[model samples]
Target: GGPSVFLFPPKPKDTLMISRTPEVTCVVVDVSHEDPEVKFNWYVDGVEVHNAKTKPREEQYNSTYRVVSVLTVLHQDWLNGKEYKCKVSNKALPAPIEKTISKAKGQPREPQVYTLPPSRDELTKNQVSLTCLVKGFYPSDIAVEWESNGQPENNYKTTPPVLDSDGSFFLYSKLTVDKSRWQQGNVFSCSVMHEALHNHYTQKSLSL
Candidate 1:
């Protein structure tokens, strides 16, 4: 009816969500220029931006020079699903050099799911935690629910979904149960609800 120890499984490569809170995005371009690197423009959502910085480097040994143009924007806007454009007007080129970055404004990206059994050390206490990790989703809003022996259980804790490097979202929700019930071979399950998953949601269960 049960495995002796529910060892935590190694997370998949893509499921390894990197936690970052800095909301700034930096885009840089390196181009050779004499006096034309000054012609730089930044646009967010096709709207004009008034802030920019350029690092100019002149090769001392050689007769070559280049400038690095860097654009900074609040990654929060990207999280909000925004686009960015950088344009450089150079007389040497027939047309203006343009670079654009676009991110997922909103979409229903289905999530990967995993559940961790109650901690072995914590099993000695009256209360134990069952953790469910939901990974690689978009739009940020998702819900997780728990059930014990096929009955609804609302007494659980869930954290706000966090973003990864790719603008997707991930989170972990925890369900708490009494050690007595945990020792009674009760079955526990967690079901995740997301727009991408539609009416049917991803669920995981375990028996002890």
Candidate 2:
């Protein structure tokens, strides 16, 4: 695998829908015009398997060099724990990619942000309690931090959620600052850091 490419799909109507539909399915392998020829290889566990234009495996995933235009092999019941792999390669090119048709197992859903605020008119001296929440993650490796005046602060609390039935997790953190601090010289910020897979994070801030 070279530079991992990931696809984040939208929530389907029936998420229980698996790729092992018994009916005929066609897999296409076409490369860019910049290349002389396109070579798409299918594999499983680092072994070359089949293409989508030739014959497919009889038991859905047998040991053979297969290439087919129809999904004559797979049955709906056979998709439970099987892993399908696909590889795109060109000898002219140095790098090759072999990605498995794995399951979307983890995630209670997706990453979403939620917040709470005090009423504007009913605001009082100490009526502000800002909280940040992120949902639908996994492994409970989220980093939630609070910053004041653009610098990270150490006076905050966080609780990373546990993985739910769908293999995802949730997380939340709360910070309370004096209303006078916000009104006079306060800059409050909350951010969620994704440090495991990618260097991506989200932040929100408010100033008085």
Q: Global lDDT of each model?
A: 0.62, 0.49
What TM-score do all the candidates reach, one by one? 0.48, 0.39
* Weakest lDDT window of 10 consecutive positions for candidate 1: 1-10
lDDT of 2: 0.49
User: Residue by residue across 46-151, what tens digits does model 2's lDDT show?
Assistant: 5555644533322223222222232222332222324555554555446665455433443323355666544465356564566677777653545577888778
| Candidates in order: C-alpha RMSD to true structure | 15.0, 14.9
lDDT of 2 at 134: 73
- lDDT minimum window of 10 residues, candidate 2: 7-16
Per-candidate clash tally: 0, 10
Best by lDDT: 1
